[PDB]
Design a protein around this ligand. Sequence first.
Ligand SMILES: *[C@@H]1O[C@H](CO)[C@@H](O)[C@H](O)[C@H]1NC(C)=O
Lengths: 213, 216, 11
Amino acid sequence: DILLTQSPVILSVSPGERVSFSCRASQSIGTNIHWYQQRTNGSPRLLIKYASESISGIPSRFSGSGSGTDFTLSINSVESEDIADYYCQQNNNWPTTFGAGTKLELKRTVAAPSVFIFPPSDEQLKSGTASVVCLLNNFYPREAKVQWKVDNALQSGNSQESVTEQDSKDSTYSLSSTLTLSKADYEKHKVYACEVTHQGLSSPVTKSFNRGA
Amino acid sequence: QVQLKQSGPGLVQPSQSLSITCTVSGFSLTNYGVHWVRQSPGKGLEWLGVIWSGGNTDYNTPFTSRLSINKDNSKSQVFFKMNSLQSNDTAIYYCARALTYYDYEFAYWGQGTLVTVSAASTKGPSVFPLAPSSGGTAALGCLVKDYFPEPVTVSWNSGALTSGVHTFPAVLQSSGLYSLSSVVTVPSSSLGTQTYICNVNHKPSNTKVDKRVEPK
Amino acid sequence: CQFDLSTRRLK
Ligand SMILES: *[C@@H]1O[C@H](CO)[C@@H](O)[C@H](O)[C@H]1NC(C)=O
């Protein structure tokens, strides 16, 4: 099998800049290489066929070049909707094989998160479990700290985070922090606060509620 | 135009078989061959096989022993069956079509079928509201909890509400069940006049829930 | 980088 090595594994550029993807074959394959794009939750999208040939419906800012073993996919003016992974595929030798892909991340101005806190619903409490969700919305960059405190006790190990992939429109991330208690432990306390630290905040933002009022 | 639609995602027990149906339109299975590609965490994109216009099949070498592709030209359906699955066969399976009848540049793809190889049980999710309570912008959402396996789809107001929606990637809890939240930001003034429903559908369990999210 | 079945993106 032809081994296709794509480098680097991560690319990070700014809008309007030009970017290049490399895909190298373990032996000569002529120009028998194809390029695909995969957005979040998407299927592959054919961008270039046979090193350089255009595909219908693909924006003109996508192009390709190369021959032999060294091939390059290029975007001459990156837009926010170009956040995806990009793969190469060879079909000069059976069976056809794909590369491992390159991730395209986009830089942008710092944006502070908007923070919201949600108590557990009375519907969930009927099942003996309490979920306290802390939402960090539309921020950049991805680095963020969430600190849970129940009656000034530091929570640790009883929460889970989830970060969306980069938004195709404004390049921001959103983060959910879910603190999980038993209904017994949730009813034995009063003050629930998530403290958020981010580069775009001059000092940590704390959202809190008292169970009831 | 040209479309490929695959059967729903589901669980498969270890050492048991997998069956996916690819129904095509916009072209005839007598004029084009249909390929099958999978995408796993370990091996990435992996070409599996193809059934040609004339009915012949080629299988990639490590799968010639447990792969079987068939079709029905009249019903425009391609049938994929792989035997004796193990945990590392857990992947997204696609059906795809090339630009030309003989080639391998894949211009049209199916939406993908996430197959989970596991001995666990299929379990539908509970849906709990994330009720609103910053500068005239309110945040609300839904808690989709304790389901298995992935995936689960979440829309808002039957697709009419997409602006400001964030459905977070699912996380695996210590119980072995997944959980996620889907949130959206709306104007505070619309909380009185507009209804906000999250449409949750966990196809592996045939669990379909619509949750109305109100201020408490 | 590893492919993520939940997001269909590389992680
Ligand atoms: C699955 O494991 C087998 C060993 O039984 C290995 O040969 C194969 O490459 C693996 N496939 C993956 C990781 O997709």
